[PDB]
Design a protein around this nucleic acid. Sequence first.
RNA 1: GUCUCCGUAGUGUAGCGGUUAUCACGUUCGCCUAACACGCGAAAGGUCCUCGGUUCGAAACCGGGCGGAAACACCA
RNA 2: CGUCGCUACUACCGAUUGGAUGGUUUAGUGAGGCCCUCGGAUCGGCCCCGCCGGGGUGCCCUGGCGGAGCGCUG
RNA 3: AAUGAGUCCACUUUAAAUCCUUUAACGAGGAUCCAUUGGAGGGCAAGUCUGGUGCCAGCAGCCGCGGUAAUUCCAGCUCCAA
RNA 4: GGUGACCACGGGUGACGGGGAAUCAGGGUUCGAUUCCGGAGAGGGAGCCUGAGAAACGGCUACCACAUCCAAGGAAGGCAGCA
RNA 5: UACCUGGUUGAUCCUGCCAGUAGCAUAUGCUUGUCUCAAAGAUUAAGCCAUGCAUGUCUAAGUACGCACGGCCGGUACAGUGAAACUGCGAAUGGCUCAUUAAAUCAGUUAUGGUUCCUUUGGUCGCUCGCCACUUGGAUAACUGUGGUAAUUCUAGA
Lengths: 441, 118, 131
Amino acid sequence: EKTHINIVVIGHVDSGKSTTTGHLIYKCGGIDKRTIEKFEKEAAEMGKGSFKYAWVLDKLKAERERGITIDISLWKFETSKYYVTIIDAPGHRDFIKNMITGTSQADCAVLIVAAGVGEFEAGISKNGQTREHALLAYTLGVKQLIVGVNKMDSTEPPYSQKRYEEIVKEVSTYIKKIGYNPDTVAFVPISGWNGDNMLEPSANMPWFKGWKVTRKDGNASGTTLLEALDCILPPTRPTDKPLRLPLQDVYKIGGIGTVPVGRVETGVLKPGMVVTFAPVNVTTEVKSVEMHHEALSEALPGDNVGFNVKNVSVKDVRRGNVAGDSKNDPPMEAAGFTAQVIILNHPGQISAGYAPVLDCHTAHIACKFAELKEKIDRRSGKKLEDGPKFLKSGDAAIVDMVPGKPMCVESFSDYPPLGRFAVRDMRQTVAVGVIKAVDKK
Amino acid sequence: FPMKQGVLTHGRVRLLLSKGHSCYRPRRTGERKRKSVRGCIVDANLSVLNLVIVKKGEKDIPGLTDTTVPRRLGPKRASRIRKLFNLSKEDDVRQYVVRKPLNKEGKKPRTKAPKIQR
Amino acid sequence: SGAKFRISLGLPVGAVINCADNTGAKNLYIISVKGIKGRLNRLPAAGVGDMVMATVKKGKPELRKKVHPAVVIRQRKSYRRKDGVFLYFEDNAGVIVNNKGEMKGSAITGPVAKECADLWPRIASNAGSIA
RNA sequence: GUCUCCGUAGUGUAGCGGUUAUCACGUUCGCCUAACACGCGAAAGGUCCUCGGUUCGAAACCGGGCGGAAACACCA
RNA sequence: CGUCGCUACUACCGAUUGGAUGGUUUAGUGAGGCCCUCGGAUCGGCCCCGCCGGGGUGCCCUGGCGGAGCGCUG
RNA sequence: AAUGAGUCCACUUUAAAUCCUUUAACGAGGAUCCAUUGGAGGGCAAGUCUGGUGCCAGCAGCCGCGGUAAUUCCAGCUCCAA
RNA sequence: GGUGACCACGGGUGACGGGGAAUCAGGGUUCGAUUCCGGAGAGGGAGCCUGAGAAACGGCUACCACAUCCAAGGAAGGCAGCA
RNA sequence: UACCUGGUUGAUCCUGCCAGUAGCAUAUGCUUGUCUCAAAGAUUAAGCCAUGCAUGUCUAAGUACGCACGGCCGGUACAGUGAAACUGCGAAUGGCUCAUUAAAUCAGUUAUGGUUCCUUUGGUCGCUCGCCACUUGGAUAACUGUGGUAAUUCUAGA
Ligand SMILES: [Mg+2]
Ligand SMILES: [Mg+2]
Ligand SMILES: [Mg+2]
Ligand SMILES: [Mg+2]
Ligand SMILES: [Mg+2]
Ligand SMILES: [Mg+2]
Ligand SMILES: [Mg+2]
Ligand SMILES: [Mg+2]
Ligand SMILES: [Mg+2]
Ligand SMILES: [Mg+2]
C-alpha cells in the first residue's frame, strides 16, 4: 503493498467538513459502533445532535463546546485502492494560519461546496472562504483536487438537478481563473449526514449518472467519493533529495518522551539516525519511527509519521520547524531569501517597509520588505522594469526579504513543497510568492 | 461470571477463593485471590444455564443421545482393568489391556498400548 | 429536550451544604438562588439541579472571600419524582460551577441526583454514580 | 488550544472620533568648581504593543497578530 | 556626635480568637485478615434389602434395576 | 633522514564483534597534519610599548586603576605560568 | 520501684552504621548515598496464605494517594531491578 | 617540604581579621592529537512511569495410550524421540536505593547449659511379639466436546 498520501478537506464554514469526514471514516472501518453510539449519546446530552460525526475529529473541548472547528485533526481509514490520512481544515479566518498549516501537509484537496440556499452564496463573497482555501492551496502546491457538493437534503427541493448544474458551472467559471481543470477536477454531490453517494450509489438522487475525469496520466469515471478518492494520481516522490520534515505538531507522551510528528518530504527517515532542526539548531538522535498507531522501519515521502528523538523537551521544539538528516546538507537559518511575490489583490501600494505575514511551509511569521529589485510580468520571468517605487495589484515582482522573527526557508528548485509559500495582509490574500534564492548564516 | 454452589444469593459477591474451591486456579502455591462470583440461585439474569438430564425420557433428542462417542482411553491401573473385565487373579492381564488403534494418511497402521502400572 | 419538574425545595437562603467536588472547599453557604423572582418575606430556596450563588465558609483560603455560582446535587428533603418515588439523600451537597455550567473542580464524591445530572451534563460527566 | 485583562517619551503615565500632552524624573545641556558639591537656564524626547477594518478622517469605534499576567484544558 | 527630612535594604512588635504545609497523638467510626463458637449449599461410605438372584446346598458366594435405611455417619 | 595522527589489506582478539598489540600499501616543510586556558602594579612570573575611552566604559579575590600622556579598562605587539 | 549534671528525658540532624576516603611533621580536622559486611524498604500504613526460611511486595487482601480499559455491568496496578 | 605574603599608620611595633597560596570534589566555562584504567540520576523528588526484558526447571533412575515424530518385526503392557500437564524444587538468592533509624542499626567480644534449621555430609531404618502383601481404594490433570464476558495468565459444565 500500500502507498501513502495526504488529503485536505476545504470549503465554507458550517458546510459540515468534520461531519462528512467522520462519517466517511465510519464507512471505511474507522471505529466500532458502540463508541460512536457513546459519541451520539454525548451529543444528545448537551444538545449538538447534528454535530455528532464532527466529534470524531473535533476532539478539543473548545470545539466541543462552541461547535466551531479550530484544530487540524488526523484519522486513518483504509480504502479500496490505498491508504489515506485526511486533513480537516478549520474553515475560519481567525484560524486561517491553522488551515494553511494543515493544507501544507496534504497531497490532494477536497473542495466541499454547500448546496443549500444561502450557504452557497455566503461562501462565494469577499467575506467568503471558498476562494481563500482554493487560492492558497494553489499557492502552497496542490495540483489535483476534487470539488464536492454537500447538503442535498437541506436544499428546496431536495436532490435537485438544476441546482447541481448551477453549482458545477459557478465553481468552474472561477476555478478556471484559480488554476484547476474541471476536466481533471472531479465533481461529486454527497451528503455526509444522510450518508448518500459516498460508499454506494445513491437512490434518492438518480439524476446523477457519474463524474468523469480526463487526465494525461489516467482517465477515470466513478459514482461514489471513494471511487474518486482512489483514482487520484500518485504524486512523484523525490526520494533522492535530502531529507526534509516540515513539522506539524509536538507532543510529550509519557514513557516515550517528546515525539515529533511531521510530513516526510524527501529522503527516508529511519530509527537510529541523528537529525537536526533548523530553527532551534539542537542535535538529536532518532530512536524509532511510527505512523498512525503502527510502526515503521522506514519512513517514505508524503507520510504523517511519529518518530521519537532523544533528549529534547516539548518547549524547545515547537510547531512549524524544519527537520533533516544531520549527515546530508541541513536546513539552516536564512537571514534573507529572494522571493517572487505575485500581487493578486492589494488596494494600497506595496513599497519597501510594509510587513505582511509570510508563511513558508507550516509556521507563520510576519516578514518585512527590504527593497524591490525588478518588476516582472505575470509569467515566465520576463524582465520589464528595474526598481519600482511601489507595487500594486496585478503584478509579479522579485524582492529581497528580511524577516524579523527567525525562520528557515528553502528554495523551489531543490524541495518543491518548501518553495511554495503565500503572502497575507489586511486579513486577505495579497501576494503569491516562491523562493528561488536564499542566504544562510 | 460463573455460579458457585452454596453462595445462597441471586447476584454477584466477592470471595477470597482458596485452592481447589471453584472458579479459581492459583498462580503460585498458597495464593488466595478475591474474585467476583455469581450466586447459586438461578434467575432470569443469566447468559447460559448448564443443565444435565439425569434419567432417560421416553424418546431420543436429535444429536444428543444418539451417536454415543466412546471414552477415549481405557484404564491404566492394573486393578482397574481387573474390575472392568472381571479378572480373578492374573488371567492374561497383558493381553486384556485395551490396544488403541490409530492411523493417518502417511502413517502405516499401528496399535498403541499403555504402560500399565501397579 | 425536557424541562425539570417542580420538586420540594428544602434549602433556603442561609443553608450551608457540603462541598462534593475536589476544589478544596469544604462547604457552601447559600446566599441566593438563580432564577427566583420572589414573594414578600419568602426565602429563596433551591432543590437539586438548581443554580445557586454560594460563598464557602471553610476551606482553601483563596476561595472564601468570593461569591461563586453553584449547583445543588444532593438534598436531605424528600421529593417526588413523578413515578411515585420519594427520594432523599443523606446530606445536602453541591458543586462549584461557572455561569456556563462546567465545574471548577474535576471530580465528584458520592452520588448525584438524576434531575441535576439531566439538567447539567457537565456535572453528570464527572458523576461517580447516578441516584 | 479556549477564555479574561494589561501594554501609550527611557521610566510616572492623563488621554478627547477633530490636539501623543503635562508633570516627577532619567539624560543632555550653557552654568560654576582643578575635579567635585550646590545654585542659575533650556530643551529634546510618542507608529498610543503592533497591524488592519468601520468612519469625512479613530491610538482609542471594531477586529486580528505579538509580549506580559491570571486561569481552563491539552495522554501516539 | 545625635535628632529631624528624603531614598533603598534587613530584621522586630503588631489587632487580625491570621493563613498554609509537615509530624505526633485523644476520642469516635471502623474495611480487612487471623482465632474461637456456631452454621450446614453440597459430595461420599454403612444399614443395601421391593427384588429378581442364589451355593457350601426358604437356609444367598453375588453378578444390576429399583425404591429408599427415610437411620448411622465422614 | 625518521616517525606517527589519520586511510586501510590480512591477522589477532572475541559468544560474535570492537579496541589495543602485529603487519601489507598510502600518509609531512607554513612538515596549514596550526595547543589552549588564564595573566603582565604589588602580593605573584611577566611591559615605566603603541593606539583608543576619559571617575564614562569598565578592571580589580584584596590594596587599588580610571575625571584628556591609564605600567591595572578595550584592542595590537612582545613576554609570563601550566 | 527504675533513669538522671559521669547530661537522664526531650529536640535537631542536609544521620543508614562500619570496613574506609580527603588533608598530611607530630596532634588532629572534615567526608563516608556509592561496588565489601550488617540493617531497613519496595507509593504510604496495615493483615495474611504457602513454605525450613517472608509480615515477601517482578505473592495475596483492605484502606489511602495517584493511576490503565470500558460496550459504564466490570476488570488490572506498583521500575528505591536492566534499559 | 614542620613555609608564608598584601591590607588600619605621617611613619613604627603589635593584636586582629580580610584577602592572597596549595590539595580533593561537585557543577560549569574554553579547548582537545594518541593510548591504558575508569566514576556516572546520591545531593532537589524513597517523585511519577508508557513499552520490552529481568525466574525458571528433567536424569537411565516420579507420572506419556498428544501422532506431534518414530523403530514395529506382526501378535507385543510399556522400543525410542518428546509437546502439554500433574508432581518436586527454586522463586526468602541476586539486583536497587538510603526514606525511617541517635545504645537504635552497627563494630570488636562473648553466650544460647535459653532456641530453630530446607539442603549437603555422617548415623538409624527385620530393635515393636501385633480371603491383596505377587502391590489396595478414589479422584484430578494433560486430552475430546459445549460455551459466557468487551476484557484478563477469568473460567463453568460434561
Ligand atoms: Mg510405577
Ligand atoms: Mg420581612
Ligand atoms: Mg593590557
Ligand atoms: Mg536520612
Ligand atoms: Mg555508606
Ligand atoms: Mg549492602
Ligand atoms: Mg522487605
Ligand atoms: Mg519444601
Ligand atoms: Mg509488604
Ligand atoms: Mg593539534
